[PDB]
Every structure is written in C-alpha cells, then in structure tokens.
Design a protein around this motif. Structure first.
Motif, short mmCIF file in Angstrom:
data_model
loop_
_atom_site.label_atom_id
_atom_site.label_comp_id
_atom_site.label_asym_id
_atom_site.label_seq_id
_atom_site.Cartn_x
_atom_site.Cartn_y
_atom_site.Cartn_z
N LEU A 174 0.86 -1.18 0.00
CA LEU A 174 0.00 0.00 0.00
C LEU A 174 0.90 1.24 0.00
CD1 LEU A 174 -2.33 -1.28 2.90
CD2 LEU A 174 -2.48 -1.90 0.46
N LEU A 175 1.10 1.84 -1.18
CA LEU A 175 1.98 3.00 -1.33
C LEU A 175 1.23 4.31 -1.07
CD1 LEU A 175 3.85 1.92 -4.62
CD2 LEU A 175 4.28 1.18 -2.28
N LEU A 176 1.93 5.28 -0.46
CA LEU A 176 1.38 6.57 -0.07
C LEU A 176 2.19 7.74 -0.61
CD1 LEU A 176 0.70 6.00 3.76
CD2 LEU A 176 -0.95 5.78 1.89
N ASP A 177 1.48 8.80 -1.00
CA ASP A 177 2.05 10.13 -1.00
C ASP A 177 1.56 10.79 0.28
OD1 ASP A 177 2.27 13.13 -1.65
OD2 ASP A 177 3.20 12.23 -3.42
N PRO A 178 2.43 11.15 1.21
CA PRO A 178 1.95 11.66 2.51
C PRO A 178 1.43 13.08 2.45
CG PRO A 178 4.35 11.69 2.46
CD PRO A 178 3.90 11.18 1.10
N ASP A 179 1.79 13.84 1.41
CA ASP A 179 1.31 15.21 1.23
C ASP A 179 -0.11 15.25 0.66
OD1 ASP A 179 3.83 16.07 2.11
OD2 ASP A 179 4.59 16.35 0.07
N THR A 180 -0.43 14.36 -0.28
CA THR A 180 -1.77 14.30 -0.87
C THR A 180 -2.67 13.26 -0.22
OG1 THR A 180 -1.15 12.72 -2.60
CG2 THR A 180 -0.81 15.06 -3.07
N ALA A 181 -2.12 12.39 0.64
CA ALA A 181 -2.83 11.29 1.28
C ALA A 181 -3.37 10.25 0.29
CB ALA A 181 -3.98 11.81 2.17
N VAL A 182 -2.81 10.20 -0.92
CA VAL A 182 -3.27 9.26 -1.95
C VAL A 182 -2.66 7.89 -1.67
CG1 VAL A 182 -3.11 8.64 -4.40
CG2 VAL A 182 -3.59 11.01 -3.74
N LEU A 183 -3.48 6.85 -1.73
CA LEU A 183 -3.00 5.48 -1.61
C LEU A 183 -3.04 4.80 -2.96
CD1 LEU A 183 -3.44 2.84 1.06
CD2 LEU A 183 -4.35 2.28 -1.21
N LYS A 184 -2.02 3.99 -3.25
CA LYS A 184 -1.93 3.22 -4.50
C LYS A 184 -1.51 1.78 -4.21
CE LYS A 184 -0.85 7.13 -7.55
NZ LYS A 184 -2.04 7.06 -8.44
N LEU A 185 -2.41 0.84 -4.51
CA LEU A 185 -2.10 -0.59 -4.43
C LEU A 185 -1.03 -0.95 -5.46
CD1 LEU A 185 -3.06 -3.53 -3.38
CD2 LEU A 185 -4.84 -3.37 -5.13
N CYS A 186 -0.06 -1.78 -5.06
CA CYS A 186 1.00 -2.19 -5.98
C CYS A 186 1.25 -3.69 -5.87
CB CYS A 186 2.30 -1.40 -5.72
SG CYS A 186 3.12 -1.85 -4.18
N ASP A 187 2.20 -4.16 -6.69
CA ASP A 187 2.63 -5.56 -6.76
C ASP A 187 1.49 -6.49 -7.14
OD1 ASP A 187 3.84 -8.02 -6.73
OD2 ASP A 187 4.42 -8.01 -4.62
N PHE A 188 1.30 -6.71 -8.44
CA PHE A 188 0.38 -7.74 -8.90
C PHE A 188 1.12 -9.02 -9.28
CE2 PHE A 188 -3.87 -5.74 -9.02
CZ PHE A 188 -3.53 -4.47 -8.61
N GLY A 189 2.26 -9.30 -8.64
CA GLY A 189 3.03 -10.51 -8.86
C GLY A 189 2.47 -11.78 -8.25
N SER A 190 1.47 -11.67 -7.38
CA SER A 190 0.73 -12.81 -6.86
C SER A 190 -0.68 -12.87 -7.40
CB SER A 190 0.68 -12.75 -5.34
OG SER A 190 1.98 -12.72 -4.80
N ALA A 191 -1.06 -11.92 -8.23
CA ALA A 191 -2.46 -11.75 -8.60
C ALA A 191 -2.88 -12.83 -9.57
CB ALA A 191 -2.69 -10.37 -9.21
N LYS A 192 -4.14 -13.22 -9.47
CA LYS A 192 -4.71 -14.23 -10.35
C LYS A 192 -6.18 -13.95 -10.60
CE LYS A 192 -4.89 -19.07 -11.40
NZ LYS A 192 -4.09 -20.31 -11.33
N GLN A 193 -6.61 -14.15 -11.84
CA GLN A 193 -8.04 -14.17 -12.15
C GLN A 193 -8.62 -15.49 -11.67
OE1 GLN A 193 -9.26 -11.97 -15.51
NE2 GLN A 193 -10.73 -13.51 -16.21
N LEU A 194 -9.35 -15.45 -10.56
CA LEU A 194 -9.99 -16.64 -10.00
C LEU A 194 -11.24 -16.99 -10.81
CD1 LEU A 194 -10.05 -15.57 -6.25
CD2 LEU A 194 -8.35 -17.07 -7.30
N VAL A 195 -11.37 -18.26 -11.22
CA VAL A 195 -12.60 -18.73 -11.84
C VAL A 195 -13.06 -20.01 -11.14
CG1 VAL A 195 -11.74 -17.73 -14.01
CG2 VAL A 195 -11.73 -20.19 -13.73
N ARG A 196 -14.35 -20.05 -10.77
CA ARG A 196 -14.90 -21.19 -10.04
C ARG A 196 -14.70 -22.46 -10.85
NH1 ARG A 196 -20.72 -18.50 -7.32
NH2 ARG A 196 -19.54 -16.93 -6.14
N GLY A 197 -14.36 -23.55 -10.16
CA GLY A 197 -14.03 -24.82 -10.80
C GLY A 197 -12.54 -25.06 -10.91
N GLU A 198 -11.78 -24.01 -11.24
CA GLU A 198 -10.33 -24.07 -11.34
C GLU A 198 -9.72 -23.80 -9.98
OE1 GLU A 198 -8.97 -21.51 -14.45
OE2 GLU A 198 -9.85 -22.76 -16.02
#
Ligand SMILES: Cc1ccc([N+](=O)[O-])cc1S(=O)(=O)N(C)/N=C/c1cnc2ccc(Br)cn12
Ligand SMILES: [Cl-]
Length: 340
Positions: free
Chosen positions: A147-171
């Motif tokens: 969870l990346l931050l700019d502390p001046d703008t308070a903006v949060l940005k999700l990062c690292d999609f190296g574990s991410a997967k499109q889950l589909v039922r059955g698989e």
C-alpha cells in the motif's frame, strides 16, 4: 549515466517508444524482484522500475494483469521492456511512502495513526479492490508493504500484482498464498476453492493493525496463525469451517468481544467495520464497495473535510460505472450531493 530503451506503453496498442531515464539507483531487492528508482529524461518525472526474471515459454501474468488496469488508487504501468537470461522491466509511477513505513513511525514513537488517515487509506484500498475484483482479479498479497502513499496528498496506491490471479470457479488454487499475518482463515484451513474475499480479510487485518498500532494476528508459524485468530474470533463452528473449506472434515475457546480488542478511544464505527470484514465465513464478509459505503467512512463524504496539512482530500467519489457495476444502488451513498 543515461539509459535509453525501446519500451512498450502499458495502455494503447503495441507501439514501442524510445524512452530515456537517468539517476538510476536500487531502492528494493526482495522476493518481488529488483526495484530501481529513476528520472524520465523528457518530463523529469520519477519512475520506479520493477525487474523480474522472465522466460519466454509463458507470458508474464503480472504484465498481462497490469496492462488491463487503469485506476487512480492503483500504481500505473507506464511502459515495459526487456533486458539482459532475460528480465522483464515494468516502468511504474513512483510513490514515495508505504503504509508499512508510516504505521511504523507512529508505533516506534508510541503514537496512534490518526483515524482520519485510517479512513483515507482504507477507503482507497477498498476502492482499488472493488475495481480489480470487478474483473475477477484477486490480488492475494494485501499487506501494508504493498500500500503505497504520498503523505502530502494522502493518496494510496495498491502495488505488486506478482501474486495476482483471475480466480474462476471450478479451477482450484493454492492455499498458502498471502503474508502470514494477513492470511484468510479459509487459506490456513487449506481451501483451494477460495474467492476474492481473501483480499477483504487482508484489508480487515490492515484496518485493525492501524487502529491497534500492531498486527492483530502475529502468528508464530503457519499453524499458530490460526491460534491467534481463535483468540479474538473464538473457535469456528462446524458450520463456519464447512464454509471456509468443505473438504476439511472432522477444541473450544470463546470469542473475545470486539470492543475489548481495541483501545477505549476507538470509534465504534471502526469496530463495526472490523467485525464485518474479519468474519470466518467468507461470503458473510463485506464486499469492497459495501466497505467503502460503511459509515466509518462518512467523514470522508463530509463536504467540510480536509487534510491535517490544510489541503483538500484526494479524489474519493469520482466513480466510473465499471466501479459501480457490482452494486449500482450504492452510488446514492458513495457519491454525496456535493460531488454530483
Ligand atoms: C515496497 C515495495 C513493495 C512492492 C514491491 N514490488 O512489488 O517490487 C517493491 C517494494 S520496494 O522495492 O521495497 N520499494 C521500497 N518500492 C518503492 C517503490 C516506490 N514506488 C513504487 C511503485 C511500485 C513499486 Br512495485 C515499488 N515502488
Ligand atoms: Cl511497430
């Protein structure tokens, strides 16, 4: 000194551009790969460059996922290229801080992270989850470091999609997949049939951690991670265990009340949110959009709200119809009058 590559833009069609960067230094070298920071030569803009080993036999899953995503609370893939035994290079928007590091300043200073920042950062997290879940992309590694931050703008940005997967039922999928502390109980129980609600459990563990000043389930091992969950939630019922993992066929400890987990100061609405995220039965947990619309975040919808540094809040209600697809009647709560 100056590096020039022929990089492909993440959005648009495959139309590679010469890109030149400089001021290259290593800012990260972990299991995620090697990460540099650099300055783009045309705009002076700061980029982070993430470099992983990529054999050509398969397409990189992270790259395929990144190129779909265009969301303000998710780090943008600007370009990608190949280098060197072949490495994939993702050129990404630089973000200067993380929730991990911020939470730690406060904790080592024996100070609480103000509830206003808890709200801003978590709302933006849930929003990023609603977006990716609408595509069936589960992140599977939601934790303060990502969870990346700019502390001046308070903006949060999700990062690292190296574990991410499109889950589909059955698989079916692998059960040992998050950072131990943020791992959903169905995963511990060896569910291979799990849903995107594992990210919502992880989100809850981050929320609670920011209120407590320390991780709520600091498991000593893969097995002690469940003993720590039992302490708070109690022993899961036969009914709950079936819902987490139907194959797990078959020890009591009572549930410790949710108010007495946190400090006396803690807003009840924050506590209510934790209980609706950190449930044993996966389908009972809030959805990321339901979470965004939880009353805990009402202060963010106040017209008068500002940041402690004096600036206005970031963009919180500019929802696309894609973001609202899962539950469109939530727009009447998610977008207040003053934003329409
Ligand atoms: C903190 C962190 C989280 C995830 C990754 N990752 O998935 O490669 C790397 C790092 S890090 O190299 O230790 N580092 C401090 N990252 C800095 C950084 C700054 N801005 C961005 C933007 C995207 C990514 Br990925 C990393 N950063
Ligand atoms: Cl071409």
């Amino acid at each position: 000194k100056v590096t020039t590559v022929v990089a492909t833009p993440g959005q648009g069609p495959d139309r590679p551009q010469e890109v030149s960067y400089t001021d290259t230094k290593v800012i990260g070298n972990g299991s995620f790969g090697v990460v540099y920071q650099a300055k783009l030569c045309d705009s002076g803009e700061l980029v982070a460059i993430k470099k992983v080993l990529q054999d050509k036999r398969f397409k990189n899953r992270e790259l395929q996922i990144m190129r779909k995503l265009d969301h303000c609370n998710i780090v943008r893939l600007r370009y990608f290229f190949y280098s060197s035994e072949v490495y994939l290079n993702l050129v990404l928007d630089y973000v200067p801080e993380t929730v991990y590091r911020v939470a730690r300043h406060y904790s080592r200073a024996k100070q609480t992270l103000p509830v206003i920042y808890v709200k801003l950062y978590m709302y933006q997290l849930f929003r990023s989850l609603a977006y990716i879940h609408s595509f069936g992309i589960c992140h599977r590694d939601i934790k303060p470091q990502n969870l990346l931050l700019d502390p001046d703008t308070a903006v949060l940005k999700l990062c690292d999609f190296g574990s991410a997967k499109q889950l589909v039922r059955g698989e079916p999928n692998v059960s040992y997949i998050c950072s131990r502390y943020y791992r959903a109980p169905e995963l511990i129980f060896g569910a291979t049939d799990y849903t995107s609600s594992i990210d919502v459990w992880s989100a809850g563990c981050v929320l609670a951690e920011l209120l407590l000043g320390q991780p709520i389930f600091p498991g000593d091992s893969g097995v002690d991670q469940l003993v720590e969950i039992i302490k708070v939630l109690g022993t899961p019922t036969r009914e709950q265990i079936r819902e987490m993992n139907p194959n797990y066929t078959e020890p009591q400890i009572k549930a410790h009340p949710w108010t007495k987990v946190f400090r006396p100061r803690t807003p009840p609405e924050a506590i209510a949110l934790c209980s609706r995220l950190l449930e044993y039965t996966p389908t009972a947990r809030l959805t990321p959009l339901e979470a965004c619309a939880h009353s805990f975040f009402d202060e963010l919808r106040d017209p008068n709200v500002k940041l402690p540094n004096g600036r206005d809040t970031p963009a919180l209600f500019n929802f696309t119809t894609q973001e609202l697809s899962s539950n469109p009647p939530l727009a009447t709560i998610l977008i207040p009058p003053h934003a329409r």
